[PDB]
Write an enzyme that holds these catalytic residues in place. Structure first.
Site, mmCIF file in Angstrom:
data_model
loop_
_atom_site.group_PDB
_atom_site.id
_atom_site.type_symbol
_atom_site.label_atom_id
_atom_site.label_comp_id
_atom_site.label_asym_id
_atom_site.label_seq_id
_atom_site.Cartn_x
_atom_site.Cartn_y
_atom_site.Cartn_z
ATOM 1 C CD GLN A 84 -4.799 -3.143 10.403
ATOM 2 O OE1 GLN A 84 -4.344 -3.657 9.387
ATOM 3 N NE2 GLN A 84 -5.964 -2.509 10.423
ATOM 4 N N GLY B 127 5.030 -0.717 9.459
ATOM 5 C CA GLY B 127 6.170 -0.497 10.321
ATOM 6 C C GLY B 127 6.363 -1.616 11.320
ATOM 7 C CB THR C 187 -2.685 1.819 1.268
ATOM 8 O OG1 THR C 187 -3.165 2.612 2.359
ATOM 9 C CG2 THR C 187 -1.828 0.696 1.806
ATOM 10 C CG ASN D 144 -3.526 -6.230 -0.520
ATOM 11 O OD1 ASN D 144 -3.906 -7.274 0.001
ATOM 12 N ND2 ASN D 144 -2.833 -5.315 0.139
ATOM 13 C CD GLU E 105 8.220 -33.943 2.268
ATOM 14 O OE1 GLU E 105 8.773 -34.526 1.313
ATOM 15 O OE2 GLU E 105 8.739 -33.832 3.397
#
Ligand SMILES: Nc1nc2c(ncn2[C@@H]2O[C@H](COP(=O)(O)OP(=O)(O)OP(=O)(O)O)[C@@H](O)[C@H]2O)c(=O)[nH]1
Ligand SMILES: Nc1nc2c(ncn2[C@@H]2O[C@H](COP(=O)(O)OP(=O)(O)OP(=O)(O)O)[C@@H](O)[C@H]2O)c(=O)[nH]1
Ligand SMILES: Nc1nc2c(ncn2[C@@H]2O[C@H](COP(=O)(O)OP(=O)(O)O)[C@@H](O)[C@H]2O)c(=O)[nH]1
Ligand SMILES: Nc1nc2c(ncn2[C@@H]2O[C@H](COP(=O)(O)OP(=O)(O)O)[C@@H](O)[C@H]2O)c(=O)[nH]1
Ligand SMILES: [Mg+2]
Ligand SMILES: [Mg+2]
Lengths: 426, 427, 102, 104, 428, 426
Positions: free
Chosen positions: B10, B134, B169, B196, B244
């Site tokens: 997601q 998952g 989360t 995050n 590279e």
């Protein structure tokens, strides 16, 4: 796609289901005659999870109502959104249990369960990808608890790979509606611990206290209470029915909230619940929702959770919101009151955001807490059960039907080892 | 020269939604799909006045994917590449690796087959996944394994989304993270971590957005990806391809985990404020207040760094700025590597997105370095993983799916060996 | 029912775009209708429009050594351009026959 | 008494679909035209789209947005969108949809 | 260059009703039968002036579908004397169709096809359309093939047969019927092409994603395949191959003639709009089992010889390049005895559309026809379920009361065993 | 072309045929005056299968009544579509059998069966190519069973190569009309195992069960049961009268269903069946038909098919349907409940599709399942027969007329070995 079929047992289960399908119908914008008239087609894309199209947009709920007394069915068909159910799904006995778990589990089940199993099967293979089942019943009454209990066992024996929700109302001494509450409740959970995937415990006392303090309503009939529980159930299934920034399905919440196979009893709270006179004076932000979520006077159980520890918790948010604010609020409530949470699991809070709020609200939240304070409730039941079992009072009505003594002993044993492992992890 | 991008989970496809939005806006392609040679590496010219991208979105829950199917970019992506399962893995690596993967990975790879046969000068793949979930972790790893047994010799750039230390989360994401690294180690070639909390801090501090969502995060992440492929897409004074990264940043075959950073993260008004030149942005690409991974690079030594420059940049001043960096002593290098820089200069400046919070700049820098601060990160993950595994929590889900303790212990010790290796190379 | 013969869904529908009712949905092997590249790359595996056949490249016109590509002949030119060309070269033909040939 | 009357109208498969192909394709595809893929499955949606089909700026904006309001016929409408319903994808692509409508 | 077409069975004439619609639409002939303002000469003879009649015979025992055809819009294309109709149907009975009603109907069929062949001049061959599961197309089909072999013999007969799918089926005694059909299909026809129904169901589920397909889309795509096969005679190509080329280049041994078919690109309107169409990917797409007309897994089998018809805008350069890529790849494996296992052919005219069809106008198309050992696998799969029912003497009494015996049952079973042995030998 | 002549025997056969010809005449659009009044041209194309035009568009049924008491004759003449029949085909006795099978097979047959054979001959050679004969009768009455089964024997003697359908209602002890029902039914089927091609086993008990559960009528009068079986018979010959995508005539239906010549007893069910309340709340898809087809509460015999195995089964479909959907549905139902089917025959389900649904409907189906469950019915009748034969109750009204004991013993023997071979194939 993913499918949720509904089951309602007993009088409370029927009235709860009636309000449940009322608010869901209003959420998806379908009229009480069964036709869509809503606004956003975001409502259309996920009505298959709860409805099947019959003829020209006639969406009927994928529900099965079941009890033993026709007065409940009349009260169902009386109110609006009562003419949208398929009359075949009103599978229904005639004699009545009458607050007897033995009648609801051996006598009447023997002639009603094959019928409901027929209906639920046809309702199961009618859809393609089953997600799970959703049950609304009681633990004090007879025709809801016993029949639903045996039904749960049969279903879990047929379909072991599908999920299962159970919204069960438990009694309290303060609000003791019938007399054999422990006799039925003990046996019910004694079966639930091996059959159900998870159980969302409810009660009426917490609801009365909530309408006392937060709502400031004068006369709380059952309709408003069922209206609250319904708002809870719409919140728990909002992730499948609407797109979001972080979607948490039913199995996803179960795997985040269940660390041990026998530790699957949750307590629930819903926000925001404010009186109408004080609705104008408030701002609507995530901290405003957070202060009401973590209030211990806002759970829907008679187990004040600060007398124990949260094992795990989950918050289901609805509305356009900053995920940063969401997470730092969760981090703050987890860092300050750090003794209220378990130590050997970091990040005890699973969060999810959906973009569509419930109708009429800006921003709402559904809390599901798997805390060890529920063992206070179970001990509060077991002591009553042992107090009665020592004297064998009201026992002949059960043993004179086919039940014997060792079933009661094993219910005591499973009750005791459950509260023992809860006390252990505390 | 072509490069295809797969998006797992997601999170990956939301990244794709901002990434491809930026690509089409860069090459002037309207969401309907047509312009009113540089596009050749991302879009195939189908038909007449039409370009389709070289990507596959894939996910088990159809909610986010079919939102893409019906959004504004309906005509750009024709929904034959947007693979979608029937039901989620539900934060379960085992469910996403054995139960559902065994029906979805085959359909994904016989679609990627004829994508690869369409391309001609395929450089490599680049994957977008989040190892906390998952689906991204389970079949993501599974897809990477079958990719390796299918091609092997081709490069694979893994841009992963690890969990933050304190900001989180999920709950079982430690289990899914460790089980992802055990295969992410010996299957990916070049792995870029992005977290995050670091991006939340960047948007709060530099972009002064008090309430950001995932969109802004994904927008500047796309800015990073586009800046590191801009060398292939447009001619520069000194350009460097995908190969590279493997040559100039991967000292040893099991040390491939690169910190990323971006500068200048400047809003519209602060651009009016500040004079943007190469020296200060070359400095700003080294503070921990501007990194994509929440970690302190002062605690570690930088084995090898890579600086992508876009816009009005001459080799003189970029060499002067890297000189000052080499002579500064606040950040120390590793004694073994004497020459730890790989520069790259491209002419076209980065583009803006309407509704984006970044302003257009004369020049920008995408730094990709390799340190031992990652060696601190994995140990930090290792600690909170053993905290849970000591009590056997949440294990019944995985073994009920059909797995065992074997891969638990072997992935645990795999991170242990990786820890010892990073501690040994830091010497 | 609706979904009986046809796929009926938006991404797979058999209904063509109303902009063009009839056109073969594919890549012609000659690419006759594409904007010409400004400068053709050294490695070019595809052809755009008019390239001389082998029957012509094996035996070129005389202006092929001077650097005039064969498409320069077949490209259309206006009247003032043709007049200036025939005046620049020593053709020296009268305007009457010029208008006739024109 | 007998049922009043029931007219017989069902045609055979041959006549229906390999002799009237040109009218059949038109009817079938004009039932499901405006609806998006995940929305076209349900029949009430097709009926709604038909009653809807029966401002060019608003039309271009619609066909640009895609899933915003195909089945519309309380909540009042704003100049851009509905109050209660704003998805994050649409919130991200508002400007692209607007530019597409302007170009159209 | 002329070739005639006979349809024996309920399935055969539906395939033909599709095919002839397609042919008229290709050649610009209105259903009345005239050309509004030479290539047609292989299917249509011109009687008098302003008429074009097909070189075809539909024939059936029950008259329902035949007079449905008669009453349809194509009344004027076939006038009423070629459409042969019996009075009662063989009713899924091979014995009844080969001995009871065949004896009355085959003589009429054959002395009509005689005058058809006489009207013809340069007859290339015959082509028959049947489903071996039914009763008519099995019994009278075999009877008609035997009598045509004894009448002509040296002309090639293209049998486009429809076999019963393994798991999907509509009859019960179709194993018996298929065994008894194949016993003569082995030694009478020259080139036999298999088509199952489950493969086409899978195709229309996957690529054309019609979730509720009727028989007509199956028949449309089969007609497309037949048109691609006969376009070489119908129109001039850059590299043309006639019907004798399959006889020659595809049949390595006189008893091995069972060809798997595949067509590409089976693609919708905006899916083609999406996909960049070229020769390499369509030659690829012609080879995966997700685009074959037969439910079999050729990964287990080894190719013996493949033929590739290309229609449309195809130059020889890229088809040679794609065939080289295929021959170098190791995902599929050709048989060692044949070094050079490919036969290409190219035709200039693109495949046309049919209104009401599901396919759009495509620049280029490929028809693959291949030989393998997946067919020997299929035959044993059939043999197993035949023997399963034959062990209990089930349904034998119907054939016996019609007038057959145990001898032909046992000999067809051992003939299929011999064919299995043959295939497992040639695969060596 | 293919031809079906109709014969009705006894009161039950007559009233069944009466409703049957009303239904068929409604399907082909001829009003009860006998003139044509249809609109679509699909109706004319196959009316030769059932009718003969006499003079100027007067269409008359190819039917032959047969009975012994004029009450039934006035009953069939009084109702509408009664004066469309053949006044000369009203071949008819005057004495009356009186539920005595010996009277129905020896006494009145000797002077009525020559005449019915005369008229059935005239009706047979009036058409060109017969498909088969169709006889509707009971197995309990006298003038239906006895006269019917002799008529069958004589006809099979005359035309051996023609098909034969017989719709026979069998008695039940729960629904028991006469006392001599085993005496009639035993000898009747004893003649049916050797003479008739195949039969369709019916009974009134299952029909009452249907009108209870699925129809939910209050007054199921005989016209209703007769309307059901008429729709069944319209379905069984919809393939001849209307073109389909997959045609299945009577003969190939027979060759697909009958694996052994003595095993020709079928049970039959019809779909869709909905109450007028639940008529609005249902869908119309192939799975909606199949889930109702294979239900055991829909078989029109008193034999639970899950008490045995299915030998073969057939599903005739009416309406424009997806063949792929038909096939996958029949495959899925066969693979799910693989125990209830026989092992040594693959693909036990013959299916067919007709493109003409019944009038006013969208899609319908007819199930004909040759199972081994019918042996329970034959044991159900045989045990009663032996119970009465053990001491010869009611025997003498049969003995004194010309029948001896060995006929009864040979009937029992044939009963015993047919259930023996049924059990053998189970
Ligand atoms: N940076 C960033 N991370 C995201 C975004 N969306 C989701 N994530 C991350 O994704 C992780 C959860 O996994 P998901 O992407 O929701 O779904 P998944 O990876 O497929 O796993 P499942 O939920 O089982 O399907 C969280 O840790 C988030 O941090 C995003 O837009 N930006
Ligand atoms: N491809 C295709 N096959 C069909 C079609 N119609 C019927 N079939 C096949 O035909 C087989 C049965 O034989 P039919 O063609 O129906 O009938 P028949 O061959 O004439 O034999 P009889 O029924 O005895 O007349 C079935 O297994 C079907 O698979 C069709 O329209 N297209
Ligand atoms: N919230 C709510 N609870 C109810 C309602 N009706 C009954 N209950 C609860 O259910 C319990 C008794 O359930 P009961 O009616 O005996 O169940 P049954 O007899 O098996 O159907 C009481 O403790 C009530 O608190 C209702 O309408 N709403
Ligand atoms: N379905 C149906 N069955 C009937 C009807 N009338 C009689 N029967 C059956 O016929 C059986 C008795 O047969 P009977 O009327 O004596 O036949 P008959 O005397 O030979 O004409 C009973 O078991 C009834 O179930 C009817 O109108 N409909
Ligand atoms: Mg996810
Ligand atoms: Mg046939």
């Amino acid at each position: 796609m993913r499918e949720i079929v509904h089951i309602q047992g007993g009088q409370c289960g029927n009235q709860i289901g009636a309000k449940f399908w009322e608010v869901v119908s209003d959420e998806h914008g379908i009229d009480p005659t069964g036709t869509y008239h809503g606004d956003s087609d975001l409502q259309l894309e996920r009505i298959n999870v709860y409805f099947n199209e019959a003829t020209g947009g006639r969406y009927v709920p994928r529900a099965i109502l079941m009890d033993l007394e026709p007065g409940t069915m009349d009260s169902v068909r009386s109110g609006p959104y009562g003419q949208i159910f398929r009359p075949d799904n009103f599978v229904f006995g005639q004699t009545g249990a009458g607050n007897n778990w033995a009648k609801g589990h051996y006598t009447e089940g023997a002639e009603l369960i094959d019928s409901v199993l027929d209906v639920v099967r046809k309702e199961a293979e009618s859809c393609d990808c089953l997600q799970g089942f959703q049950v609304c019943h009681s633990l004090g009454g007879g025709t809801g608890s016993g029949m639903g209990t045996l039904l749960i066992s049969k279903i879990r024996e047929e379909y072991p790979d599908r999920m299962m929700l159970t919204f069960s109302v438990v009694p309290s001494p303060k609000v003791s509606d019938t007399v054999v509450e422990p006799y039925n409740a003990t046996l019910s959970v004694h079966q639930l611990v091996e059959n159900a995937d998870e159980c969302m415990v409810l009660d009426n006392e917490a609801l009365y206290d909530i309408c006392f303090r937060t709502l400031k309503l004068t006369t709380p009939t059952f309709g408003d209470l069922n209206h609250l529980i319904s708002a809870v159930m719409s919140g728990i299934t909002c992730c499948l029915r609407f797109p979001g920034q972080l979607n948490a399905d039913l199995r996803k919440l179960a795997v985040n909230l269940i660390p041990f196979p026998r530790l699957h009893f949750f307590m629930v709270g819903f926000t925001p619940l404010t009186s109408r006179g004080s609705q104008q004076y408030r701002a609507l932000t995530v901290p405003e929702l957070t202060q009401q979520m973590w209030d211990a006077k806002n759970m829907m159980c008679a187990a004040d959770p600060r007398h124990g520890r949260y094992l795990t918790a989950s918050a289901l948010f609805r509305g356009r919101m900053s995920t940063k604010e969401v997470d730092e609020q969760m981090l703050n409530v987890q860092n300050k009151n750090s003794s209220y949470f378990v130590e050997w699991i970091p990040n005890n809070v699973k969060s999810s955001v959906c973009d569509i709020p419930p109708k009429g609200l800006k921003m709402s939240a559904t809390f599901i807490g798997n805390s060890t304070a529920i063992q206070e409730m179970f001990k509060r039941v077991s002591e009553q059960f042992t107090a009665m079992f020592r004297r064998k009072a009201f026992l002949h009505w059960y043993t004179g039907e086919g039940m014997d003594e060792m079933e009661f002993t094993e219910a005591e044993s499973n009750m005791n080892d459950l509260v023992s492992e809860y006390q252990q992890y505390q | 020269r072509e490069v295809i991008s797969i998006h797992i989970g997601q999170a990956g496809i939301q990244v794709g939604n901002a990434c491809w939005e930026l690509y089409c806006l860069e090459h002037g392609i309207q969401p309907d799909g047509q312009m009113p040679d540089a596009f050749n590496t991302f879009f195939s010219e189908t038909g007449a006045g039409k370009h389709v991208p070289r990507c596959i979105f894939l996910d088990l829950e159809p909610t986010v994917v079919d939102e893409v199917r019906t959004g504004t970019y309906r005509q750009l992506f024709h929904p034959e590449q947007l693979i979608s399962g029937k039901e989620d893995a539900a934060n379960n690596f085992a469910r996403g690796h054995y139960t559902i993967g065994k029906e979805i990975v085959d359909l994904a790879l016989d679609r990627i087959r004829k994508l690869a046969d369409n391309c001609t000068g395929l450089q490599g793949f680049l994957v977008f996944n989040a190892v906390g979930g998952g689906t991204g972790s389970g079949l993501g790893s599974l897809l990477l394994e079958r990719l390796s047994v299918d091609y092997g010799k081709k490069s694979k750039l893994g841009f992963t989304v690890y969990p933050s230390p304190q900001v989180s989360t999920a709950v079982v994401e430690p289990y899914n993270s460790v089980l992802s690294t055990h295969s992410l180690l010996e299957h990916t070639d070049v792995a870029v971590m992005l977290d995050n909390e670091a991006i939340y801090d960047i948007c709060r501090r530099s972009l002064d957005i008090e309430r950001p969502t995932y969109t802004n995060l994904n927008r500047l992440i796309a800015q990073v990806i586009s800046s590191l492929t801009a060398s292939l897409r447009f001619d520069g004074a000194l350009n460097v391809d995908i190969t590279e990264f493997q040559t100039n940043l991967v000292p040893y075959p099991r040390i491939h985990f690169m910190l990323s950073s971006y500068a200048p993260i400047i809003s519209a008004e602060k651009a009016y404020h500040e004079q943007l030149s190469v020296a200060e942005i070359t400095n700003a690409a080294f503070e921990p207040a501007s990194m994509m991974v929440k970690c302190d690079p002062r605690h570690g030594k930088y084995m090898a760094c890579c600086l992508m420059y876009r816009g009005d940049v001459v080799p003189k001043d970029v060499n002067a700025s890297v000189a000052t960096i080499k002579t500064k002593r606040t950040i120390q290098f590793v004694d073994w590597c004497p020459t730890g820089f790989k520069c790259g200069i491209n002419y076209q400046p980065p583009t803006v997105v309407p509704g984006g919070d970044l302003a257009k700049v004369q020049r920008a820098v995408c730094m990709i370095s390799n340190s031992t601060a990652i060696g601190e990160i994995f140990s930090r993950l290792d600690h909170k993983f053993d905290l849970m595994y000591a009590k056997r929590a949440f294990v019944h889900w995985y073994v009920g799916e059909g797995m065992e303790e074997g891969e638990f212990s072997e992935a645990r010790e795999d991170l242990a060996a990786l820890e010892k290796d990073f501690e040994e190379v830091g010497a | 029912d609706a979904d009986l013969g046809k796929s009926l869904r938006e991404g797979y529908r058999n209904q063509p775009k109303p902009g063009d009712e009839g056109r073969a949905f594919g890549v012609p092997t000659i690419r006759t209708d594409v904007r010409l590249p400004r400068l053709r790359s050294v490695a070019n595996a595809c052809n755009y429009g008019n390239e001389p056949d082998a029957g012509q490249v094996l035996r070129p016109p005389r202006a092929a050594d001077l650097g005039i590509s064969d498409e320069a002949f077949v490209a259309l030119r206006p009247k003032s351009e043709l007049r200036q060309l025939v005046d620049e070269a020593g053709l020296a033909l009268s305007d009457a026959d010029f208008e006739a040939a024109w | 008494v007998l049922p009043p009357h029931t007219a017989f109208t069902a045609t055979t498969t041959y006549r229906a679909e390999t002799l009237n192909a040109e009218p059949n394709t038109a009817a079938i595809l004009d039932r499901s035209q405006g609806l998006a893929s995940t929305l076209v499955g349900y029949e009430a949606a097709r009926q709604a789209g038909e009653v809807r089909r029966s401002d060019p700026r608003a039309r271009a904006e619609d066909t640009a947005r895609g899933i915003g309001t195909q089945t519309v016929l309380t909540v009042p409408t704003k100049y851009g969108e509905l109050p209660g319903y704003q998805t994050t994808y649409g919130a991200a692509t508002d400007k692209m949809a607007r530019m597409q409508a302007d170009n159209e």
